[PDB]
Amino acid sequence: MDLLKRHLAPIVPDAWSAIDEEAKEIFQGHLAGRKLVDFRGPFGWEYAAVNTGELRPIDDTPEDVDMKLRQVQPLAEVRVPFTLDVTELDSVARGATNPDLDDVARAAERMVEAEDSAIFHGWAQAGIKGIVDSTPHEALAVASVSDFPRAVLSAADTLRKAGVTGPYALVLGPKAYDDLFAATQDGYPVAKQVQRLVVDGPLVRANALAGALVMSMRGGDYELTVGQDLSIGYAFHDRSKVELFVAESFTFRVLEPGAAVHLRYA
Amino acid sequence: MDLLKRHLAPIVPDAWSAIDEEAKEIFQGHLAGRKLVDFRGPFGWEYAAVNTGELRPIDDTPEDVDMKLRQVQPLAEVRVPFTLDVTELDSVARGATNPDLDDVARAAERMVEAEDSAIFHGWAQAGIKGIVDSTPHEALAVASVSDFPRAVLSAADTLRKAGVTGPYALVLGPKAYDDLFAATQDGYPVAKQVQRLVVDGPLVRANALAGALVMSMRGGDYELTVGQDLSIGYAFHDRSKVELFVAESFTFRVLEPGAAVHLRYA
Amino acid sequence: MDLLKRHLAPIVPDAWSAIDEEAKEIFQGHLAGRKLVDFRGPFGWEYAAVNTGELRPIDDTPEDVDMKLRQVQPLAEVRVPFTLDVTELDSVARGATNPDLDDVARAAERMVEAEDSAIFHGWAQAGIKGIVDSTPHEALAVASVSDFPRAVLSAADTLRKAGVTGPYALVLGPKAYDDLFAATQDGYPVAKQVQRLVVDGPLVRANALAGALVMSMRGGDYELTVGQDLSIGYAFHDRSKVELFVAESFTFRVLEPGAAVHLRYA
Amino acid sequence: MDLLKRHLAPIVPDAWSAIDEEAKEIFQGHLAGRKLVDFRGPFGWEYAAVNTGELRPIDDTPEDVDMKLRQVQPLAEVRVPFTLDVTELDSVARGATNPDLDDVARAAERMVEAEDSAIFHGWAQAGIKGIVDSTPHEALAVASVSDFPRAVLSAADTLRKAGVTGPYALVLGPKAYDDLFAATQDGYPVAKQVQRLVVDGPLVRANALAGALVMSMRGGDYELTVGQDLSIGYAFHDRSKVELFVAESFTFRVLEPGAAVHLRYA
Amino acid sequence: MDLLKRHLAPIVPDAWSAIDEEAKEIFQGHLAGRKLVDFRGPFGWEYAAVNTGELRPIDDTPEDVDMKLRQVQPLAEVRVPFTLDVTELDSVARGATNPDLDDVARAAERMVEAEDSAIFHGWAQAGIKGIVDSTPHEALAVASVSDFPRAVLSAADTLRKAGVTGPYALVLGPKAYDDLFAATQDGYPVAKQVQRLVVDGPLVRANALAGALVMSMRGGDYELTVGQDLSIGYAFHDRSKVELFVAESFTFRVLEPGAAVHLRYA
Amino acid sequence: GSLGIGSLR
Amino acid sequence: GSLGIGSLR
Amino acid sequence: GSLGIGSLR
Amino acid sequence: GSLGIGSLR
Amino acid sequence: GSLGIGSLR
């Protein structure tokens, strides 16, 4: 909101629209974790921590009093700075449709990388455990791409034996995705068989994920909480350059660590 | 109902909802026999036996009197105990969404195993004959997974020659299911051909079944009668633990033993 | 109707329903000829012969008179006896749902065999010529199952050259049906290609047919006339057994003998 | 109309209906040219020639006068005689449903052959140029059936380079049709790929065409004009035989000779 | 409009319709660039240049004044002459339906070639940069046709890493198109797999494009501006010939040069 | 009083 | 008085 | 007071 | 007075 | 004042 301070920027409204559009297309295209996990909607700049509902025993307490401490997970506030030329942004008021906005795309992809790598592989400095590093199940080795169907079925069986039901999604890192969607077994495309074995939507390509992943879609296992949602704010400017940032506040919780199985790349 | 004694448990209503939800997802996902057989709806705690309509001659009877005894099949009442921590259940009143409920899942899968293994392979102690052990037809050997189409057709022919018509379902045990849905013959997926040969629904994966099974879906051959349906009841508690159970009363009848053919695993 | 004399049988109405249901499921499942030929609807017990509209010259006639005899095809009345236990039938009044009715199924399949073998291969004692034995076209040899597409096309061409147009059905005997629906050519299922080459309905499996058959579905080539349709009647009973029968009156006519081509089994 | 003189025939109305039905089923099934070319609707017995709109310079003309002759294409009137037995036709008034009408089918197929062979290969005696003999493009050699996709694409490219746009139809002679619809390449049916490469309707099988043909369906390239449409007329009768004919008046024009490419048989 | 001067031509209205129809079918069939790029609608004969919104510093300027020059891209006006016989055009007033119009088709295909070759490969004399010659990404070598899936995925990845999102189209030159749509890998058609990997519409065949192309369809990267749209105008005539032209005014802009990847032919 | 089969196609 | 075939496609 | 499973197909 | 082609997709 | 991305599935 007013923490973004956008009315102080030397930017015309149509250039603000161009910046927002550029960031928005990247975010809608590339945010993979938000496609897969439960979303606790944006709560604003004041939301500070997620209540886990848990209690921790306090050490050195007397005998006539029982004392316990509430547990929370504080949110991380993330800012990715970027810089734009003021003349390039003035161009759009003269009717230019392609202002130089590559630093917007750079900052948006960096923010996507931060969020998705926290969701899939954790962010220890933010106190975040990811899906892959928190699963207790043994990682399955997928020797070749043609082994993906068997592996998927095997992973589903593992999830079934741990009590994790629900439709199962296959999430592919970039290399696994490209190899799977190029592969044929005696001409028949492997991705067709694999798609028949999982949830019927398009398979999620997750740029931040190493290898592949099979996870439950029943809900309630993985929860991303957003405070301030992805925003563009103004920081500073001089005569020629304006400094902006991408801002988000969020945290990610693994509620059920055994709801995913990691597949080693094929 | 009041035999479950749930109002005496030291459990808040939302923790009761969490326990019930956990058991319910497992039951809706994993109960294979209830997907395949006729269901004689829940009759309550007072239903004791199924009337078969049959009579048995009584030995040592005089000549001016004909005496016969009615035949019934009494229901089995099954209880699977499990234990929960009271603090874990109090957590949900503090807003926790993932209380430790793995013993609920354990007990629910144990109950699923009991019911499904009675339906498919019998439960002699309960006086229950299962589908597989009551069929007179010779079991077909499926040498490899690619033999499944032929075997299915062969099984259908057998059922046709015994007078058993009706659409035919293929029911797969875990190993047969995984091998069938991973298999390709020169790249073409075998499960596609097999699915074209049977009833068009998704093939039932039955965890309790050994090998595979071809059975008629015309109705009236296999009947599961439920008295008290799957329920969670309260037994006892101390300061730290609460003892609950999964309860069900049921019996299973094979009305037409020749309505199924057993396939030896592929 | 009253020739069935069912009100004289020592059978309760629900046991009559069970007998009729058992016969009806077999008839609806297994009567293959009635799926393929024109049906001249049931005319009752009084219908005696089909008028062919033809005339035959009478020998030894004078010169001032021309004399000719009308041609008819008389119907055959067919009865298949079967016997049931009276106690088994009384069981259903006590609530039994699976009375011993295997002789009903035996008699119904015997009647199905009689009708279908008359339609496909003729019944000389009844003055019936069948589809296969009346065709003038040379029978095609199908060496292997993978030759079925070519053969089908070849048969269609033959039917086209004889003036027989119309969509063409492939009718398979049991062995040809099972081999075709199990067969793959380099993994690709042969039955898929064959189904693309013929009328789009499910291919008819005819238990009474030897080999396979390609026939026109334009109509007007093959006509089954029914007088009394398939019925269950009562004949006699003693203290323990009741004698029933399956009854039908029918005849089958080949109007266009060159409307089918016989395929030798694959 | 009254040139058919049908009211003078010793034929009952239902026998006339049977004759017309027999001819009509053959015509609707086997007339391939009428499925592919523009149809200039029936104009009746008085329509004599098609106006081409062209002028031809007249030789030996003076210098104060310019003289030119209009060009027309006169229609051909075609009659195919056939003979029926009068007793066979009287049979239908006695209720016979299969009178001997093989000469009707013979005459109808002969007429189909005449029309379609004029459309595809020309009829010089009638002043008709056909599609195949009027194309300037070089005929493509299709070595085997598996070469049909490439050939089709090649033919389309040729038609594209000559300015002939529009969706392209593949028309198959009998041998090419049967070979294409029986053929598999490593189990995959060739006709499936070919059908994906052309207009989505069922591929036309043309009995009168040698080899195969790729032609534009944009319209305006090939025009069949009908005067008197296909009719059955009466010619003569004696005590035992009646002489009838199939009659049609028509001509065929190639407006754009380069709108088709001929494929040499596979 | 009146610059076409059509009312001065010795051409009857139906011959004008025939000429326009002939040009229009070619244009709607063969204009590939207009299927792929943004279209800035026809602005008429007065539109002279596209405003790019950019400014260029002016050399040799004083210190108390800042001076910059607006940048525009002027449109190219393109005329393709062709000649028709006046007698051929008079033929249509006499009812001829196929006047000699091959020079119309020649001129229309020449104009299509000019526009599409400017869009794909540039037109330096008109100050136009094309899609292929302006991309910074390295061209991918497609060794064989069966490499097209991998290449497509690889190209998409490249476009993803440059910030170019959006659904991706595969555009094929003539040789690549024909090879792709004829190709099979163990019988399975390669074009089927490729079509599953891209936007679901029919793949664009671009006659003017060398090799193949993967480009974003998000919009805003490639902009064709039309002033006077494709028109037929009259230039001159003598007693026997009339001179006409195809006219268009247009320019093409690459707004985002990195939104396409070039594939070297397979 | 028949089983009511009739024509099957 | 024709058979009424006409255009077939 | 059951879980409400009932018939599953 | 153009042919009316316009945008083609 | 965010970009309005929210949940994506």
Residue numbers in the entry:
A (entry chain E), B (entry chain A), C (entry chain B), D (entry chain C), E (entry chain D): 1 to 266
F (entry chain 2), G (entry chain 3), H (entry chain 1), I (entry chain 4), J (entry chain 5): 917 to 925
Provide the authors' original text about this structure.
Encapsulins are protein nanocompartments that house various cargo enzymes, including a family of decameric ferritin-like proteins. Cargo enzymes are directed inside the encapsulin nanocompartment by a terminal localization sequence (LS) that binds to the interior face of the encapsulin. EncFtn oxidizes iron in a similar manner to other ferritins, but due to its open structure, it must be associated with an encapsulin nanocage to act as an iron store. Together, the encapsulin EncFtn (Enc:EncFtn) complex can perform both the oxidation and storage functions of classical ferritins. Here, we investigate the structure of the Enc:EncFtn nanocompartment from the halophilic bacterium Haliangium ochraceum to gain a better understanding of the arrangement and stoichiometry of the complex.
To capture the extreme open and closed conformations of the fivefold pores, we performed symmetry expansion on the I1 particle set in Relion3.1, followed by masked 3D classification without alignment centered on the vertex. The closed conformation has a fivefold pore diameter of 5 Å, while the equivalent diameter of the open conformation is 15 Å. The closed conformation of the fivefold pore is consistent with observations from the crystal structure of the T. maritima encapsulin and high-resolution cryo-EM structures of other encapsulins. To understand the structural changes taking place in the transition between these conformations, an atomic model of the encapsulin protein was refined against both maps. In addition, our focused refinements of the pentameric subunits allowed us to build and sequence the 117GSLGIGSLR125 peptide from the EncFtn protein. This region of the LS forms a network of hydrophobic interactions with the inner face of the P-domain of a single encapsulin monomer, with further stabilization by several water-mediated backbone contacts. The core GxLGIxxL motif found in this region of the LS is conserved between the H. ochraceum EncFtn and other proteins in the family and is observed in the crystal structure of the T. maritima encapsulin.
